[PDB]
Amino acid sequence: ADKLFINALKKKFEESPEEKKTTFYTLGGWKQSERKTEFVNAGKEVAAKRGIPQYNPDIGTPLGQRVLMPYQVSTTDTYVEGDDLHFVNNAAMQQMWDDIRRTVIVGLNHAHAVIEKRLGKEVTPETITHYLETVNHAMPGAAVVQEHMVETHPALVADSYVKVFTGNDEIADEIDPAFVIDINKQFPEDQAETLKAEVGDGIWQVVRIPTIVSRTCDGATTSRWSAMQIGMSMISAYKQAAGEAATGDFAYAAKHAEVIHMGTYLPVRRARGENEPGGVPFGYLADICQSSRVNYEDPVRVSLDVVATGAMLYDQIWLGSYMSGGVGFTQYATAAYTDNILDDFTYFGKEYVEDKYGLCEAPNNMDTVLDVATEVTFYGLEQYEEYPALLEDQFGGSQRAAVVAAAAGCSTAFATGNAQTGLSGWYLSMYLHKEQHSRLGFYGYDLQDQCGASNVFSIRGDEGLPLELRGPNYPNYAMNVGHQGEYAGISQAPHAARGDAFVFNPLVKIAFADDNLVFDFTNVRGEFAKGALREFEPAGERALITPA
Amino acid sequence: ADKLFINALKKKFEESPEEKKTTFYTLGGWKQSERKTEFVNAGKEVAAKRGIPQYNPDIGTPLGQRVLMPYQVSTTDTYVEGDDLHFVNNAAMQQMWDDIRRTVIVGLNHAHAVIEKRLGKEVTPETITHYLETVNHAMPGAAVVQEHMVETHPALVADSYVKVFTGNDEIADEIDPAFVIDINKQFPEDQAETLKAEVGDGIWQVVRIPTIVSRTCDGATTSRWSAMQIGMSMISAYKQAAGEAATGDFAYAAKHAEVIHMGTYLPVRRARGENEPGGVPFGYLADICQSSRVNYEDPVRVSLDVVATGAMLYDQIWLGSYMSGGVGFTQYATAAYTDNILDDFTYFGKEYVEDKYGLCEAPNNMDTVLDVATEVTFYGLEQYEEYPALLEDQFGGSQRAAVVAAAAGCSTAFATGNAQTGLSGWYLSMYLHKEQHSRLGFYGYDLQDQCGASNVFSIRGDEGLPLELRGPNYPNYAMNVGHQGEYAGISQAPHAARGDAFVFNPLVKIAFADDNLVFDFTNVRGEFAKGALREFEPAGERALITPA
Amino acid sequence: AQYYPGTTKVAQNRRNFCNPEYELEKLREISDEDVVKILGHRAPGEEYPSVHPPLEEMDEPEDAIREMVEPIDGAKAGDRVRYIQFTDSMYFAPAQPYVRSRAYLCRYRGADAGTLSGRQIIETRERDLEKISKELLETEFFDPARSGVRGKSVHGHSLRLDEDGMMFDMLRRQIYNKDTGRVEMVKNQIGDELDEPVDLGEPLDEETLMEKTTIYRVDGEAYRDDVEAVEIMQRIHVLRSQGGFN
Amino acid sequence: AKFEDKVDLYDDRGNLVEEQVPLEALSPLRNPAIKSIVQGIKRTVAVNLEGIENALKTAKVGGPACKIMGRELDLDIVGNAESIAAAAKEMIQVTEDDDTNVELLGGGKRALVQVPSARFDVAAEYSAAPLVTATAFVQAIINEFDVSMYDANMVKAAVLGRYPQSVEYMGANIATMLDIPQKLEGPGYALRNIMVNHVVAATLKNTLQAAALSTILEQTAMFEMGDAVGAFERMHLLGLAYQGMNADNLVFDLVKANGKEGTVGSVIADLVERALEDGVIKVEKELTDYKVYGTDDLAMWNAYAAAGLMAATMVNQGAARAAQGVSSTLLYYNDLIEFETGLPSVDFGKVEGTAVGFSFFSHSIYGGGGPGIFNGNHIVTRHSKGFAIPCVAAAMALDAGTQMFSPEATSGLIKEVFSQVDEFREPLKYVVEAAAEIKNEI
Amino acid sequence: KTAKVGGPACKIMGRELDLDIVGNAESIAAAAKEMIQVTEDDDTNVELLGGGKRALVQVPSARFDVAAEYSAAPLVTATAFVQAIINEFDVSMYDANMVKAAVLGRYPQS
Ligand code: F43
Numbered sequence A, B: 001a002d003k004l005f006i007n008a009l010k011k012k013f014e015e016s017p018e019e020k021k022t023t024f025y026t027l028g029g030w031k032q033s034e035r036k037t038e039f040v041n042a043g044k045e046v047a048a049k050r051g052i053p054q055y056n057p058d059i060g061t062p063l064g065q066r067v068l069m070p071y072q073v074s075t076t077d078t079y080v081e082g083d084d085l086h087f088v089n090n091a092a093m094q095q096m097w098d099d100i101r102r103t104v105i106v107g108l109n110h111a112h113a114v115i116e117k118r119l120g121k122e123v124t125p126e127t128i129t130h131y132l133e134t135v136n137h138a139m140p141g142a143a144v145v146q147e148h149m150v151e152t153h154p155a156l157v158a159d160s161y162v163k164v165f166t167g168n169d170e171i172a173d174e175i176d177p178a179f180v181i182d183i184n185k186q187f188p189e190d191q192a193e194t195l196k197a198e199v200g201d202g203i204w205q206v207v208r209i210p211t212i213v214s215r216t217c218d219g220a221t222t223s224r225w226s227a228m229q230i231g232m233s234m235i236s237a238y239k240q241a242a243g244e245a246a247t248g249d250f251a252y253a254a255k256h257a258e259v260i261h262m263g264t265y266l267p268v269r270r271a272r273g274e275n276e277p278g279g280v281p282f283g284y285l286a287d288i289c290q291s292s293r294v295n296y297e298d299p300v301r302v303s304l305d306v307v308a309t310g311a312m313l314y315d316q317i318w319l320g321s322y323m324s325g326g327v328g329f330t331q332y333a334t335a336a337y338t339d340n341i342l343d344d345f346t347y348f349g350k351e352y353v354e355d356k357y358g359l360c361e362a363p364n365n366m367d368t369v370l371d372v373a374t375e376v377t378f379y380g381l382e383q384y385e386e387y388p389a390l391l392e393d394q395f396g397g398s399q400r401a402a403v404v405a406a407a408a409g410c411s412t413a414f415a416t417g418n419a420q421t422g423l424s425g426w427y428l429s430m431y432l433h434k435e436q437h438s439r440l441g442f443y444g445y446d447l448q449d450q451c452g453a454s455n456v457f458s459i460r461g462d463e464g465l466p467l468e469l470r471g472p473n474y475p476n477y478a479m480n481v482g483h484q485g486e487y488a489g490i491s492q493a494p495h496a497a498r499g500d501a502f503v504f505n506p507l508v509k510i511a512f513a514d515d516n517l518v519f520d521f522t523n524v525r526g527e528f529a530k531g532a533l534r535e536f537e538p539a540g541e542r543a544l545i546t547p548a
Numbered sequence C: 001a002q003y004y005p006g007t008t009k010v011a012q013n014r015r016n017f018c019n020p021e022y023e024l025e026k027l028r029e030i031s032d033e034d035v036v037k038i039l040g041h042r043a044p045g046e047e048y049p050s051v052h053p054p055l056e057e058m059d060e061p062e063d064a065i066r067e068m069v070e071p072i073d074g075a076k077a078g079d080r081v082r083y084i085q086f087t088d089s090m091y092f093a094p095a096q097p098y099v100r101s102r103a104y105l106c107r108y109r110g111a112d113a114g115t116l117s118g119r120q121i122i123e124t125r126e127r128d129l130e131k132i133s134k135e136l137l138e139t140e141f142f143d144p145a146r147s148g149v150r151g152k153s154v155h156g157h158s159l160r161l162d163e164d165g166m167m168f169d170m171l172r173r174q175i176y177n178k179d180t181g182r183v184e185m186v187k188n189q190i191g192d193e194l195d196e197p198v199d200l201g202e203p204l205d206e207e208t209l210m211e212k213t214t215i216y217r218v219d220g221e222a223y224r225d226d227v228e229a230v231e232i233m234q235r236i237h238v239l240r241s242q243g244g245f246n
Numbered sequence D: 001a002k003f004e005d006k007v008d009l010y011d012d013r014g015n016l017v018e019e020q021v022p023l024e025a026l027s028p029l030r031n032p033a034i035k036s037i038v039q040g041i042k043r044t045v046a047v048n049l050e051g052i053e054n055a056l057k058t059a060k061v062g063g064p065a066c067k068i069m070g071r072e073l074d075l076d077i078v079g080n081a082e083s084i085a086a087a088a089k090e091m092i093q094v095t096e097d098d099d100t101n102v103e104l105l106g107g108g109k110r111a112l113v114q115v116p117s118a119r120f121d122v123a124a125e126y127s128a129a130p131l132v133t134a135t136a137f138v139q140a141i142i143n144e145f146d147v148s149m150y151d152a153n154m155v156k157a158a159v160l161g162r163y164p165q166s167v168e169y170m171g172a173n174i175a176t177m178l179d180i181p182q183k184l185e186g187p188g189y190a191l192r193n194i195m196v197n198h199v200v201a202a203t204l205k206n207t208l209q210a211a212a213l214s215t216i217l218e219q220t221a222m223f224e225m226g227d228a229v230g231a232f233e234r235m236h237l238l239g240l241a242y243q244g245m246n247a248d249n250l251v252f253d254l255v256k257a258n259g260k261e262g263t264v265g266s267v268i269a270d271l272v273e274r275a276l277e278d279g280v281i282k283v284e285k286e287l288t289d290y291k292v293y294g295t296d297d298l299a300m301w302n303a304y305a306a307a308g309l310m311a312a313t314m315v316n317q318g319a320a321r322a323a324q325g326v327s328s329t330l331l332y333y334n335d336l337i338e339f340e341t342g343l344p345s346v347d348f349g350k351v352e353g354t355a356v357g358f359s360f361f362s363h364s365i366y367g368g369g370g371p372g373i374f375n376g377n378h379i380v381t382r383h384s385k386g387f388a389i390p391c392v393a394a395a396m397a398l399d400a401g402t403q404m405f406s407p408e409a410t411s412g413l414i415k416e417v418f419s420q421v422d423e424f425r426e427p428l429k430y431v432v433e434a435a436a437e438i439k440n441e442i
Numbered sequence E: 001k002t003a004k005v006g007g008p009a010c011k012i013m014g015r016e017l018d019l020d021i022v023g024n025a026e027s028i029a030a031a032a033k034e035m036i037q038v039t040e041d042d043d044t045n046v047e048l049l050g051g052g053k054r055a056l057v058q059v060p061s062a063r064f065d066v067a068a069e070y071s072a073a074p075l076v077t078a079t080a081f082v083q084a085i086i087n088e089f090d091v092s093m094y095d096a097n098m099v100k101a102a103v104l105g106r107y108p109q110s
């Protein structure tokens, strides 16, 4: 059958994708593009309005001496210019990040113990449901105890709420389903079994604070906001004095002893509090993505939906804005989620492994790394040599490095069932690619790559860690594009081939299984397309409080 | 003339402001309020659409057993319910913080030295203008060198630009005036000569990144995004190789050697990067406020505009959201910028000092602190005792403590011309207030207050600092409402009485003298009222990229 | 002990509340059962719940401090720590917030007192809290119009009185009866209805409020005219200032 | 001697040990026992061998609720503890007869480790203790079982957690009384970031010993911060002696006189009477039926008032056998004593202010928690320069079981290991002995 | 002398203090050394350089054998110089906080 990227290549260029030569310089520069024309016209209107020159196509070099391509968002039939995938221009991408940033998981297990022991009061499904009505009034920023409080406008904060989950079906089935993330409904039976056994009789809140507040403030706001309104709702629903010594145990539990942040804080050169992208480990990012519970018959689709989630968040918003900015890193990321290119390469590797070893049945060793990662690396590179249109599409060497090594690392992990030999296969891919073409990525691309082999299996203080625990703050990884989201894919790959319900944290997996999110985490690439088409409706806007 | 709060008190209550008795429980609870009625209807609509209960006026206790008051925004004739002053519901308050978070001051002194000495090229006003045209194309997120770049939509980033300023008039006037903050146009003559003398021949950029990016990301993004696009524009405008060794000197200069952040980063318990509210020292907040260059004839007006700036940012957004959240701290802050109350007390103290000493003529010593702070404390407290409507308006002791002590500390600093004795007067005010009424603030209000006297003049490592250099991270101040914005007013007070152009950093003062900002920093209380009326137009919205 | 400087009635009243040798005037009789109901922590005839086992069951190591310090009776038993909280009107209630915490730590053992503008609280072992609470409710610490027993929703210290002379209470826990002139407690301190109300006696008249109040005000005794009390506050300020420097 | 002051030192039963000891013999800068305590707390690690084994068997590594399915490793670590510990010791020590200690506890489930002092004399800070211990035990476990290159990174995760993705050793199965250098509120604060519950657990809830260990750590931090340099040095040394070392038996004797029926206010009256009797204060002025007291030695008045404050905490929270009211004692002891006397309270108002925020953040929704989770580096309790947190330690030593976040809940690993160490467990004893020993060298 | 304290471009108008610190370097250094040292004749070194414009300071090693880390060097040094400057000129309580800011900067706000 046609390689999976042929349809996109045929959409992009007049020539067939095998053709070796073309014509350039005849497209009228930016004038070939609907989006660039929109931008030129908007630039003139902005500069007049404000009295300062702004976007101008004649400053600097003239874009569009070649074709300015459309991109197919992989797994869709949506084709857009790449500017519609820039996170600034895509409200789905911004909301994906807000939905992670404004979430925190907060136990009720210490809290219910404080109620039973210090206060000497009972906790039941009834009292939990009362508490949940109370906290769902309070969490978006409304009052429950004091007179003369002034509150948030409910429609500005309509995306904030609190749900719960528990592995105890007796309690879960009894609460108003309005407040419950129901594991049995959300997950297929095998996975639900696993998840309920991990959670047991623990009861956990999934708290989402308002998008408008997360945008005004920062990620480190989330757990504090959550704990203040849990605290008020504990006082109101359990009839404490409104501020007695036991009130402090609820605060310590909700802020520290039973909180799960999405991200941990960062070192000072890249100082950031909790719930910022750099603090989100790769295992959590794979668990936030909800492809695992929908597409579990297809480990490739689960793994590459994780890669899309991570490439966009880690490269476009994190490295391309928080850690840099400007035009940024759209296409360093879109190479991993468009034109079905990574999908072609990764399905080849899955096929290879399934036929040779069977999924998860290869020895977990260097022999398997050398076999699978070399075979898949040579397949991906041969596609760029056989399809000149594919090479002109993924024109930057970094893009190609990330894509070919993601397919090689994911396939290696589909063979071994272990992410660490997956990661070794990523690095070997890079070394083979560098020798094959006498280039790899950008000037700084392979800092991590050359440290890579030696740190995959190290055990030393700031070197040794299973891949699932690594993230954008692992030292070698802290700077460079074209790695982090692919590593989240490698982290997902062995667990998707094994059929595991989660990669690193079962609470995080359950906490995103919720259709009351604004972004649909089951279909990340579909959402990116919807945002690119200007059809996604984000939360957080101020239109209600601004003039017509 | 009547005390300045009398009109507000007659608007709020049917009784005369002196009347000791009223009627409660007859107003129908929330049904007396237009805004609560809007909230009850919106909560029904939000809960029905999303299938989770939300705002419910029957949760917890019934608001409005007493009058739910309007507030006059001081210095205006706008009266609004306090919910319209909550930062979530007030787009002017959100934009004020966005405009600070997204600004960074970046020298061209080291940069121009790199160009002349290392690249061996000349800098003149003409090459500076050409660099400014280039960076105003690139700063909002558009390309100048590479082919096949995808860019931000110019209309989503219309608020991002770069201007410059210099103290050399003849050089300022040679650069294209579209890009220049003109010191002589913006400041009255004496302040303009002071500021130009501080700057000298130095040349500085004021860089504002897009509000939509700042809201997506964080404050620590601002100096990075700035430097990326400065770097691209130095490549394009001075004809560098696009990435050579000298490129890294422009990066280090723009990111470290000649950057001035609005806020410094925070320690780990309250981890945050740069350009977050807790890092903004009080002297910078007084300098950001532009009342000094417009209302310089009236040092009370200048000082209390800075109090409004700071009470909103530091108590509502910073302490009431970044550091807590929920319903938060609206009226802890509104007490300092509504009903002309703090204005009445502070004009009393300014006239007292004029009559007894003369502004800035009192000895800078403890005698002056004891005289002025005691006299002004008792005046303020007597007003709450004479006017039961005033006491019922500022019903929380913390609100009274902050208002009475701000008037006492600003008046002491108007007498001595020195902010340190102003700060001693603030603490003495709290100690007298506590003994007069046998109460002060909330449970934790006077942690800094009791450490206060001893730490005013300490010189020890984490104790001793002039007030202008303190901020929300000064250890004793790091937690509590009702102090930080008032301290920024006391830091402004002696400088407004002296006629000084700035309080702590002349570059920050100039950097906000710019009508291209979205928020008008010359009239902070006017803007708060505009936002309360839903008449402010913020930047950063996603309407262009979302369904009609 | 001296307790407090000043030469006003307010100052003397602040000293009398602190001084455990001053006999607080008793103004009203309340039954043990009704103190329990107003506290709201346990029902009539309910055994004291425990937070830990009795001290004698614990077999602790030798500790000279613990051996010297006699535990209050509720600590010997392992009782929960519970609370009672009061709000005092700025219109001349007899006790006020810092007056209460200062007095409590001179009069009562094993006490965690907290002061705020609108509420003041003590937390201690439950059977001991019921004995202290009787005294806080029956004596001139309390007036049933200008002071309120309130575990939540405390607003009113700074509000105008109603036409009966009663402080505002969002939850109306204390009701004056227009025809009879007595206040009744109709809800416990957290706002739940009592099966039967508790009579709290007559509000003190204006003269008696002025005799007994501990707040300074321009329309009562002004703090600024109690020049000796102001001198000591100013002294403290100046001595803390100099000591923090050198 | 720079200072002429002498103090009498007692044991924790109120018996005299040594009379007329020069003040500086108690200085952290001179006293060898405080040196050994501080170098001990830098170098001592608790290793939870059972916890490492369990984390590996379940693959629950990297922090709360985290697990990697498929990564389980079943290793008989506790059954081979002796061998593992000896091999870790060979990598930990510098030479074979140095002061490295590696001692199994709990049948091999735990190990006390003391990394040799000499590693610290060539180090900037104190992180060599957890980092040298962690790698020596990771390597010893790998070498005991010949764990493969493909699996060994799980042993690393079970010992040290999610570091370096996390800044902290998140999910680690080792523990120290110190916390990482990045968590300091300011430079010089590391001896202040020691949970109160860890001090109370190391000293087995002996009230005087908990107050002494806390004081020694807090006032030693005051030296490292520069607070006790120059003008302030004597004030800090006298606070250490009188508030934390029971100098002149002042704390002890106050508690004895007030323990049966006393209150915060009775202890104040007794301390004011003792300060007057000793000449530390005198009447300066008579107002109307009110004596205004003065002092010509503010550091000694501060110290006497600090001893009274510790006694008042012991009386107040000792009578309740409940620690929570320490925040109120710290507040109103100081607020009452200033209106009782006309003199400034302990630390010139900064204990009182620490207590206002500590009271709020131990009885509200906004943060903090119960007394035992605070420390001198906590934002709420850092403000007084050593004169508040030792009272919190005494109060938690006297708590009979009212806390959810008690030392049993937060500090059990610390307790098993660090209470083995005599100088950590009974520091009052060792510091007084060392002071008596160097008495004639000051 | 310029009131330029607290970081790049920062100044507090009205706070200037004109103190002849370099002309009195020897006395200031000696007074700082007496606070820095633990004992007389220990390993504390305070040596003037550049005719009193600079001082090399080596804080005694014993202060580090009773410290967790190394911040006692700048902290003990800064406070001994702040106090020796204040004591050399009899700087008042009202003004001394500017000496502190000129030595150690915007800490602890930064
Ligand atoms: C539950 C606490 C304890 C705690 O940790 N925080 C609370 C409650 C909290 C909630 C109340 C929202 C609600 O009703 O659901 C919020 C809004 C913080 C949040 N979570 O959003 C808040 N206080 Ni409080 N809090 C306030 C205040 C106060 C004053 C109110 C005194 C009075 O007589 O009314 C007193 C402290 C004092 O006595 O000095 C106070 C207490 C308290 N404060 C008592 C509840 C008092 C009661 O039972 O009525 N706040 C104030 O004094 C004014 C500003 C006001 C804040 C809201 C705003 O700024 O608009 C609010 C700030």
Ligand SMILES: C[C@@H](OP(=O)(O)O)[C@H](NC(=O)CCCCCCS)C(=O)O
Pocket: A224, A255, B269, B270, B319, B320, B323, B324, B444, B478, B479, B480, B481, D361, D366, D367, D368, D369, D379, D380
């Ligand atoms: C104390 C500390 O909380 P923790 O004890 O660390 O949970 C801190 N919060 C605060 O300071 C709350 C400040 C604003 C709320 C109270 C205003 S009076 C913080 O979250 O970092």
Ligand SMILES: O=S(=O)(O)CCS
Pocket: A442, A443, A444, B243
């Ligand atoms: O040219 S560089 O490799 O320095 C940067 C690529 S975006």
Ligand SMILES: O=S(=O)(O)CCS
Pocket: A243, B442, B443, B444, C116, D360, D363, D364, D365
């Ligand atoms: O009641 S508390 O002082 O704890 C909180 C006031 S918002």
Ligand SMILES: [Mg+2]
Pocket: A173, A174, A175, A176, A177
């Ligand atoms: Mg049902």
Ligand SMILES: [Mg+2]
Pocket: A515, A520
């Ligand atoms: Mg949906």
Ligand SMILES: [Mg+2]
Pocket: A518, A520
């Ligand atoms: Mg949708």
Ligand SMILES: [Mg+2]
Pocket: none
């Ligand atoms: Mg007069």
Ligand SMILES: [Mg+2]
Pocket: B515, B520
């Ligand atoms: Mg304008």
Ligand SMILES: [Mg+2]
Pocket: C029, C030, C031, C032
């Ligand atoms: Mg009776």
Ligand SMILES: [Mg+2]
Pocket: D286
């Ligand atoms: Mg006499």
Ligand SMILES: [Zn+2]
Pocket: A214, A215, A216, A217, A218, B214, B215, B216, B217, B218
């Ligand atoms: Zn943001």
